[PDB]
CSV table of C-alpha atoms and ligand atoms in Angstrom, one decimal:
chain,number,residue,atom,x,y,z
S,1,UNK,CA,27.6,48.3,68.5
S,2,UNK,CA,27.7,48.1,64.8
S,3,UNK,CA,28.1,44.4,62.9
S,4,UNK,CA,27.9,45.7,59.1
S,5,UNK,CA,26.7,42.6,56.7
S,6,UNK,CA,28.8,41.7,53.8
S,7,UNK,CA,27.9,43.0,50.3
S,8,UNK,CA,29.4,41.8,47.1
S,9,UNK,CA,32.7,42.5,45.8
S,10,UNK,CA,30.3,44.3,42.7
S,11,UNK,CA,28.1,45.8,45.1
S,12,UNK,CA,31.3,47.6,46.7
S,13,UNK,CA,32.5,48.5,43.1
S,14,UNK,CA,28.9,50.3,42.8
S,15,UNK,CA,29.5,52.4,45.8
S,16,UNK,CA,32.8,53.6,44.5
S,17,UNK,CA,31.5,54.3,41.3
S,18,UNK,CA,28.5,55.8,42.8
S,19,UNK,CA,30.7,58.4,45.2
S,20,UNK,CA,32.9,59.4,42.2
S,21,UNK,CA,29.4,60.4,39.8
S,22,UNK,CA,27.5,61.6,43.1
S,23,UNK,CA,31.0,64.1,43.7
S,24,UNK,CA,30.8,65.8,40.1
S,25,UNK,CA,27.0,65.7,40.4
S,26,UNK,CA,26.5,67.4,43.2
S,27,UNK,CA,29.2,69.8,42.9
S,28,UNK,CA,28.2,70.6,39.3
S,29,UNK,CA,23.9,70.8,40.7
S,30,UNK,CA,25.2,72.9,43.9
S,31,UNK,CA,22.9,70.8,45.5
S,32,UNK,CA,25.2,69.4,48.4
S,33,UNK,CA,22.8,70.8,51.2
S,34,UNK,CA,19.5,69.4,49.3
S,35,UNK,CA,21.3,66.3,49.7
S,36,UNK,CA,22.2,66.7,53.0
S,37,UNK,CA,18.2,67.4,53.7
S,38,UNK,CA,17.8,64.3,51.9
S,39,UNK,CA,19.9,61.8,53.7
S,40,UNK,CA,19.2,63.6,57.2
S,41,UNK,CA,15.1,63.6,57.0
S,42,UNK,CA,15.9,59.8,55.7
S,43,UNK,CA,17.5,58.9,58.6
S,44,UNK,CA,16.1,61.1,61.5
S,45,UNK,CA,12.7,59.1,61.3
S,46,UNK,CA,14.6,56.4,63.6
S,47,UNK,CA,12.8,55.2,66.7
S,48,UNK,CA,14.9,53.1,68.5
S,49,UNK,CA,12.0,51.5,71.0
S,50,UNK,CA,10.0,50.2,67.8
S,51,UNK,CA,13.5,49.8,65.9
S,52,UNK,CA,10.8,51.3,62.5
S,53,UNK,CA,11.8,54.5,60.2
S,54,UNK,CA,15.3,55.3,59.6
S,55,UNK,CA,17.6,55.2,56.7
S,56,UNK,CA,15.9,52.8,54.8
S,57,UNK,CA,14.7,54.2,51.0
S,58,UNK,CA,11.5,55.2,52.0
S,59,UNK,CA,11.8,59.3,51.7
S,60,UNK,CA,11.6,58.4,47.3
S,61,UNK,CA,7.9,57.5,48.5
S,62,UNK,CA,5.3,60.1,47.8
S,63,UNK,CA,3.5,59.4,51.1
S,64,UNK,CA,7.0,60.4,52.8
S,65,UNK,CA,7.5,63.2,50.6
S,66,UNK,CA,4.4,65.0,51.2
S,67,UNK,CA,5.2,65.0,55.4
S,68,UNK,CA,5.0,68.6,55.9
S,69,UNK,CA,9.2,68.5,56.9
S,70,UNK,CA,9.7,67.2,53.9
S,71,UNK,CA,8.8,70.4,51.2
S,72,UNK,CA,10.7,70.4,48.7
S,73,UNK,CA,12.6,67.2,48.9
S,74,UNK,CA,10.8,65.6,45.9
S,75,UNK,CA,13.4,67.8,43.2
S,76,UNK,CA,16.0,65.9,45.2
S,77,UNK,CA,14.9,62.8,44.9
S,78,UNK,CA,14.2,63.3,41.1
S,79,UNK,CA,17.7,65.1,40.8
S,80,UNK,CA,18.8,61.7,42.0
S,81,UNK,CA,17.1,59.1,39.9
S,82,UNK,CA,18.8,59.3,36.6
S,83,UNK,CA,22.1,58.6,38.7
S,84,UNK,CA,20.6,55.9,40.6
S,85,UNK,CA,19.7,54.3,37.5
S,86,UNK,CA,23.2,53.8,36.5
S,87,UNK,CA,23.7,51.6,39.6
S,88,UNK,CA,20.7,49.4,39.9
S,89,UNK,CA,22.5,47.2,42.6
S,90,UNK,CA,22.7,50.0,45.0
S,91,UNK,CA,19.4,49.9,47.8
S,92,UNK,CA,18.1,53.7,47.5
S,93,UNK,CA,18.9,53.4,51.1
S,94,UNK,CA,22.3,53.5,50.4
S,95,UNK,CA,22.7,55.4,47.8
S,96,UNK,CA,20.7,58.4,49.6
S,97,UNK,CA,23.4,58.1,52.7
S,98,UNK,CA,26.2,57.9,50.1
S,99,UNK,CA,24.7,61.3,48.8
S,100,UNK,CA,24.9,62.6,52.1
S,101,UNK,CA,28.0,61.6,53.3
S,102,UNK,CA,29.7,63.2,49.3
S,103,UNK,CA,27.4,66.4,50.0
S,104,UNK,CA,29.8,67.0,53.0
S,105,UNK,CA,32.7,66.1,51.4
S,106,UNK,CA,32.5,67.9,48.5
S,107,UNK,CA,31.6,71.1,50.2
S,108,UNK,CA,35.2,70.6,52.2
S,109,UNK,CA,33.4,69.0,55.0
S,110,UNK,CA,35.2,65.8,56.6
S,111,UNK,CA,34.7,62.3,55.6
S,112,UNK,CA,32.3,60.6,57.2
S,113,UNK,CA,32.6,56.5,57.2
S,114,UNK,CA,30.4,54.8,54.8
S,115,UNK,CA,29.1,51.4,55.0
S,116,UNK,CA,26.8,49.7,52.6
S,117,UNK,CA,24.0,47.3,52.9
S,118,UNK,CA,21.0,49.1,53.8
S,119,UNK,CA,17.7,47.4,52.5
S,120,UNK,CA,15.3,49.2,50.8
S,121,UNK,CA,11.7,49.0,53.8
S,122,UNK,CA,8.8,49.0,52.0
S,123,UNK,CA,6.3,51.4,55.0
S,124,UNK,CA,7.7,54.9,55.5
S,125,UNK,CA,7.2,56.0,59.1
S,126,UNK,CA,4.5,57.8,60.8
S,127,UNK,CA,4.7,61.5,59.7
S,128,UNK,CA,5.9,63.8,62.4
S,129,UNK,CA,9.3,62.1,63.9
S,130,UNK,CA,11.4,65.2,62.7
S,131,UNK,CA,11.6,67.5,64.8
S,132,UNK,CA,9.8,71.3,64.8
S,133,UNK,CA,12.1,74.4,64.4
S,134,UNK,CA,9.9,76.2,66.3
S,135,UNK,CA,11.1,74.4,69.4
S,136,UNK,CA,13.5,73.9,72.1
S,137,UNK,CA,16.1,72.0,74.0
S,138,UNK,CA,13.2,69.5,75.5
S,139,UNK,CA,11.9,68.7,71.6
S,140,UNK,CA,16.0,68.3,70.6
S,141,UNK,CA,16.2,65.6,73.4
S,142,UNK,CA,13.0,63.8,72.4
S,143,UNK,CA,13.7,64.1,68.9
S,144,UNK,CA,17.1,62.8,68.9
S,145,UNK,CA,17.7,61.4,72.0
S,146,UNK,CA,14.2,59.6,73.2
S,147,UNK,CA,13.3,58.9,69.6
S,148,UNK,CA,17.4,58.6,67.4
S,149,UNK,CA,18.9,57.3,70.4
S,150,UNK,CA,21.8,60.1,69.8
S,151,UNK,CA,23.6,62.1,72.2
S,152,UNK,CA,23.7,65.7,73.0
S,153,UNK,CA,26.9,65.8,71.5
S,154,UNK,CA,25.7,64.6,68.4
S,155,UNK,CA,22.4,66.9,68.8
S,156,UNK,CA,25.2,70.0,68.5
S,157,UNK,CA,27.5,69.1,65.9
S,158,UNK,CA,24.7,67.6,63.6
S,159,UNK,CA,23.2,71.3,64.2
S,160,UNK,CA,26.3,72.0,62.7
S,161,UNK,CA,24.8,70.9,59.3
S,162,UNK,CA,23.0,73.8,58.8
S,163,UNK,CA,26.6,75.4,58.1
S,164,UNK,CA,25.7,75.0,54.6
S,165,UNK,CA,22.2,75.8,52.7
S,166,UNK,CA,19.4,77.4,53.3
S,167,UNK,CA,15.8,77.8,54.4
S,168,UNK,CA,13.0,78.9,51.5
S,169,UNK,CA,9.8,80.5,52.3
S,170,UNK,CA,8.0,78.5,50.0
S,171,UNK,CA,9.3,75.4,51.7
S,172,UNK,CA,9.3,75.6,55.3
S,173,UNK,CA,8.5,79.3,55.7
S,174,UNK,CA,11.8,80.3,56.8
S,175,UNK,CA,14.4,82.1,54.2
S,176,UNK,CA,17.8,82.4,53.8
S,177,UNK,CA,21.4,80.7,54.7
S,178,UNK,CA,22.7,80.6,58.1
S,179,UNK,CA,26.0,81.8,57.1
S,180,UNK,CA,27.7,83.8,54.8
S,181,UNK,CA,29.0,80.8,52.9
S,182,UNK,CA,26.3,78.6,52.4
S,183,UNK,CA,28.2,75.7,49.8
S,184,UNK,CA,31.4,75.8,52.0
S,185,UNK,CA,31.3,73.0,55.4
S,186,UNK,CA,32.7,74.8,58.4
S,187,UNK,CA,32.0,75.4,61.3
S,188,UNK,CA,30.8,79.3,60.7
S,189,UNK,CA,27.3,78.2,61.6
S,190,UNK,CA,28.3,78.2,65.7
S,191,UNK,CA,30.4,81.2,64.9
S,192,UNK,CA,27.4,83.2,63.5
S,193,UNK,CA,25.0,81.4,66.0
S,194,UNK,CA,27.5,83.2,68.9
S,195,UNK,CA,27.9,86.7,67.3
S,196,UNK,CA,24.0,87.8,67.3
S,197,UNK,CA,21.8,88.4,64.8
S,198,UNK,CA,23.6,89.7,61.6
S,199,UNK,CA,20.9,91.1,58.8
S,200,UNK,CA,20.3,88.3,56.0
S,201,UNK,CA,21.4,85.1,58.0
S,202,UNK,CA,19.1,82.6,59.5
S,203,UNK,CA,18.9,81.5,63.1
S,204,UNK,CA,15.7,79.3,63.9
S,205,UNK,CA,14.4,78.7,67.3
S,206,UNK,CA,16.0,75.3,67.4
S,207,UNK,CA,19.4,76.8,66.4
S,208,UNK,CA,19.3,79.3,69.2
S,209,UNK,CA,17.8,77.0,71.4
S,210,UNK,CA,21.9,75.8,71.5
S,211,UNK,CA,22.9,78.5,73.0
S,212,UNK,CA,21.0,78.7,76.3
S,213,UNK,CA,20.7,75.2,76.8
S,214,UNK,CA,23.9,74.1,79.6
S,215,UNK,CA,25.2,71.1,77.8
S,216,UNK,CA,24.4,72.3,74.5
S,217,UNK,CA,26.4,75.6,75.0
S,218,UNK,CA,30.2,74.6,75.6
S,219,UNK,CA,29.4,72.6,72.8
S,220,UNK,CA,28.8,75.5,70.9
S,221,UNK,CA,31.5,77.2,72.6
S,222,UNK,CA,33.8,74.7,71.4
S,223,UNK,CA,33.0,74.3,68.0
S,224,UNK,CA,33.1,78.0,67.1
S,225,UNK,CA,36.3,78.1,68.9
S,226,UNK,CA,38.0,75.1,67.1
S,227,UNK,CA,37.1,73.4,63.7
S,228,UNK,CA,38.7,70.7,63.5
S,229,UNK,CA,36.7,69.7,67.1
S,230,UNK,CA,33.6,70.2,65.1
S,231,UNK,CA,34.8,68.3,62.2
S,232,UNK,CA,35.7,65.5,64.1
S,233,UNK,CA,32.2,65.7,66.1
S,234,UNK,CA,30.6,66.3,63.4
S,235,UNK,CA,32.0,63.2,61.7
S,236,UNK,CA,31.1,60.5,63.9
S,237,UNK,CA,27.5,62.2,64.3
S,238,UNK,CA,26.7,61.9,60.4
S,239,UNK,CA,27.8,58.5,61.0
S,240,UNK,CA,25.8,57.3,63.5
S,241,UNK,CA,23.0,59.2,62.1
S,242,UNK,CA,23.1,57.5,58.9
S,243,UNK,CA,23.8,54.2,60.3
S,244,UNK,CA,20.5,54.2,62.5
S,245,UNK,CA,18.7,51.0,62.8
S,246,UNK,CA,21.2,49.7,60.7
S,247,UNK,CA,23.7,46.9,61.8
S,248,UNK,CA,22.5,47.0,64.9
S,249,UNK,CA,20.2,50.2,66.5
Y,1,LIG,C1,18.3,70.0,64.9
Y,1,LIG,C2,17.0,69.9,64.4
Y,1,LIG,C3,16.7,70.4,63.0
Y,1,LIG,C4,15.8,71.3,62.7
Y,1,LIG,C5,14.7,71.9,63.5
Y,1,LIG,C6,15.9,71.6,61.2
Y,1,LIG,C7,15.1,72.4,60.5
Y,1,LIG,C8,15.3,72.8,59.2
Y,1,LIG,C9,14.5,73.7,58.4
Y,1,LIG,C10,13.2,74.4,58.8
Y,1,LIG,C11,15.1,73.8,57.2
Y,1,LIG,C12,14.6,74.7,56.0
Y,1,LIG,C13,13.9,73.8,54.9
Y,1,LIG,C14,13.6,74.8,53.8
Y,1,LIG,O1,12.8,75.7,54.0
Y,1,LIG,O2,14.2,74.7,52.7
Y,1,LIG,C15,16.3,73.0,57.2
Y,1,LIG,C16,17.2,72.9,56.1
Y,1,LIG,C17,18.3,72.2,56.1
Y,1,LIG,N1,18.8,71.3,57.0
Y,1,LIG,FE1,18.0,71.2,59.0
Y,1,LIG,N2,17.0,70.9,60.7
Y,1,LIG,C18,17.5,70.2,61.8
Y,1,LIG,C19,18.6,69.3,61.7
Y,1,LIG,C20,19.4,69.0,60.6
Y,1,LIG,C21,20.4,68.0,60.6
Y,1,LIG,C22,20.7,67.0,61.7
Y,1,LIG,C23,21.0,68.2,59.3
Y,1,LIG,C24,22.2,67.4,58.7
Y,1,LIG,C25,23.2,66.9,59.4
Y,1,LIG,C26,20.3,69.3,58.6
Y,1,LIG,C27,20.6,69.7,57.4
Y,1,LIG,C28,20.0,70.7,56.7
Y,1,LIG,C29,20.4,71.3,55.4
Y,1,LIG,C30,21.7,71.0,54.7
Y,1,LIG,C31,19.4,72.3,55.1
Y,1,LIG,C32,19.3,73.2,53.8
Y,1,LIG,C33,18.6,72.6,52.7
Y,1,LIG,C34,18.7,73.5,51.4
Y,1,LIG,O3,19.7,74.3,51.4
Y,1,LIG,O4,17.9,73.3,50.5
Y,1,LIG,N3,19.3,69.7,59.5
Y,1,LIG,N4,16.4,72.4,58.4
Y,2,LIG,N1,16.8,73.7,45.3
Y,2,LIG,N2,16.9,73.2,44.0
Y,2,LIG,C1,18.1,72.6,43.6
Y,2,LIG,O1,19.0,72.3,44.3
Y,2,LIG,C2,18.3,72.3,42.1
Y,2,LIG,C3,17.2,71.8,41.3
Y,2,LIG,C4,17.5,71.6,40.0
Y,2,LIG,N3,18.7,71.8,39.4
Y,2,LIG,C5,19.7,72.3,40.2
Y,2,LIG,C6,19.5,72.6,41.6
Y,3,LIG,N1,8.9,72.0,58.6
Y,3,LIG,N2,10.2,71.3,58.9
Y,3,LIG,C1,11.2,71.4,58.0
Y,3,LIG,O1,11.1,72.0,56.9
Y,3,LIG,C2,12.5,70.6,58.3
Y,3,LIG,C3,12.7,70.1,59.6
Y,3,LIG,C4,13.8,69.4,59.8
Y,3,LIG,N3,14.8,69.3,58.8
Y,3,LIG,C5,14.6,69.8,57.6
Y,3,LIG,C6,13.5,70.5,57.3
């Protein structure tokens, strides 16, 4: 469904340049899953019936940065703005996706598609469109179904996110890393989610919420079972994700 607009040919030199400096950035800050935050709470705002929020610049706005979800995403936004000022042209909008999608990437995640053109919106959306880790299967589906317009495939594998970082008590309230290996993409966060449990690993509600829900659960299954799957799944999820409202959602 996607009709991407054209972009100069130094616009698309920009987002080269920009993936290369976000890549030794990122890896050097060991701040891939801060970006990751980043470009996810930018683009999970969506609402496809009022076609407002989404992945449109608006998370560098202080009135977006002080929603609740949003603790602690402020450092990444000011990690971000002495790179962003090297490529002016860029819309924050894309250069926060392009973050993203290198925060996978350079964690040994796949590579997700990127397309530029995203303007910069100047009204952040209403505060409380992310969703609350405190609940279930229902909240997943309003969240990112009702609300994204995503699928339960895509509610699973973008779960699979979580694979690398953590949670901080001084943030949300939670603490830790939900796997062992928490600046390394795989798809240990389904195997860990599976296993129970294991003393200084994080499972939230909405994490475990996965695992009883019936079309959730073989995708679990799956995805613990075979990487690759995940990768692929995952892939096309970050996609769509960051491509929300844009080119046609
Ligand atoms: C499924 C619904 C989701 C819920 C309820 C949820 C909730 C949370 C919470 C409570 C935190 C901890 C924040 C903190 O205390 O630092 C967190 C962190 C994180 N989330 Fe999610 N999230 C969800 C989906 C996603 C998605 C779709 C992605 C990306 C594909 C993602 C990527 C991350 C990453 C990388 C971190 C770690 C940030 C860091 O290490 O500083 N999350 N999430
Ligand atoms: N959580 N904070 C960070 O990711 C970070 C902040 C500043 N410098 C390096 C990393
Ligand atoms: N309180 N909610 C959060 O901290 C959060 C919710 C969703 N994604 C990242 C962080």
């Amino acid at each position: 469904g996607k009709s991407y607009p054209t972009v100069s040919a130094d616009y698309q030199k920009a987002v080269e340049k920009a993936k290369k400096k976000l890549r030794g950035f990122i890896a050097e800050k060991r701040c891939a899953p801060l970006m990751l935050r980043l470009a996810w709470a930018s683009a999970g705002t969506f609402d496809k019936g009022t076609k407002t929020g989404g992945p449109f610049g608006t998370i560098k706005h202080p009135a977006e940065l002080a929603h609740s979800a949003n603790n602690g995403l402020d450092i990444a936004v000011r990690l971000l703005e002495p790179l962003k000022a090297e490529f002016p042209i860029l819309s924050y909008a894309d250069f926060y996706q392009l973050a993203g999608v290198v925060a996978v990437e350079v964690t040994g995640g796949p590579e997700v598609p990127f397309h530029p053109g995203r303007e910069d919106k100047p009204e952040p959306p209403p505060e409380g469109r992310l969703p609350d880790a405190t609940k279930g299967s229902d909240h997943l589906r309003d969240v990112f179904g009702k609300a994204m317009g995503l699928t339960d495939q895509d509610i699973v594998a973008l779960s699979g996110g979580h694979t690398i970082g953590a949670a901080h008590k001084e943030r949300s309230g939670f603490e830790g890393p939900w796997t062992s290996n928490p600046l390394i993409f795989d798809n240990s966060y389904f195997t860990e989610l599976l296993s129970g449990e294991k003393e200084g690993l994080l499972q939230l509600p909405s994490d475990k919420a996965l695992l009883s829900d019936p079309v959730f659960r073989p995708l679990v299954d799956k995805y613990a079972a075979d990487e690759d799957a995940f990768f692929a799944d995952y892939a096309e999820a970050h996609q769509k994700l960051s491509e929300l409202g844009f080119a046609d959602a």
